[PDB]
Amino acid sequence: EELLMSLKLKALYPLTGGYNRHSINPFYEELVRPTEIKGLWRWWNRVLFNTLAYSTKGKLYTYESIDRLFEDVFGSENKKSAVRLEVITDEGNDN
RNA sequence: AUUGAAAGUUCAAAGCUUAGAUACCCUGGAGGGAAACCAGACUUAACAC
């Protein structure tokens, strides 16, 4: 709905895998997968949330419950994610 | 011991005849096959030393 932020990142020796477990295939090349960025963002978010909850309450919550709590930003089966990721790899034309 | 006595409102007779539940009439309007999801995890064994 509106661009929130924009991050020019840089990965060194990425080993991104596609359907053939490689960054390239007979049909396209894909060095960065937005689905992997989203999944790793959620994984790190759960790690960080248990970190917090343990540095204050000494309690640790299941991943189910953490993502159920964050389902307003990351979405779930009951709600569409509020954040939309858009990778733009420069030179990312047909290869 | 009467303006009385006596006297079957009875007989024959088809609620029948003609007549179209028909005429006009859009199952249509509104409605995203979407939402969520890491192609990833990790080296081990053997003998020599």
Structural tokens at position A62 = 């299941």
Ramachandran category for residue A91: left, alpha or beta (phi over 0 → left; psi -120 to 50 → alpha):
left
Method of determination? Answer: cryo-EM
Residue A54's alpha-carbon distances to A43, A64, A66, A70, A71, in angstroms, are: 17, 17, 13, 18, 21
Ramachandran category for residue A83: left, alpha or beta (phi over 0 → left; psi -120 to 50 → alpha):
beta
Enter the resolution in angstroms.
2.4
Measured in whole angstroms, how far is the alpha carbon of residue A37 from the centre of its chain? 3
The answer to whether the CB of A75 falls within 8 A of the CB of A68 is no
In whole angstroms, B39 C1' to A57 CA is 36
The partner residues of A13 in beta bridges, in order of sequence, read none
If one counts every other C-beta atom within 10 angstroms of the C-beta of residue A76, the result is 12
**Which residues are in reach of strand B, CB within 7 A?**
A 15-19, 21, 33, 35-36, 38-40, 42-43, 74-81
List bases in chain B with any atom under 7 Å of a protein Cβ. Answer: 34-40
